[PDB]
Amino acid sequence: CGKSEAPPPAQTPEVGIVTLEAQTVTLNTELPGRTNAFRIAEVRPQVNGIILK
């Protein structure tokens, strides 16, 4: 008639303690853009006439 079920306690192990200290780090930032030629010349004529060749 009842009078049972003794509760045991727990220990809860396996905690991952990791410490941290100050440091010196450099900061960067990504910026989007395009690539362009170093020098590009569009060939344009300076006379009048028919392209023969």
Added chain:
Amino acid sequence: KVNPDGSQVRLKDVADVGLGGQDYSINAQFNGSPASGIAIKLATGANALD
């Protein structure tokens, strides 16, 4: 808005985003302490004791 040369405007330059309340009309407190809760009514035809 993004231009073809890469310049752009994101949704942190015109606004500030955060998790807030859906409605700010009604607010409760309990003995001065900040509190919220749900008020429960009863469907008609059902017993209020069970």
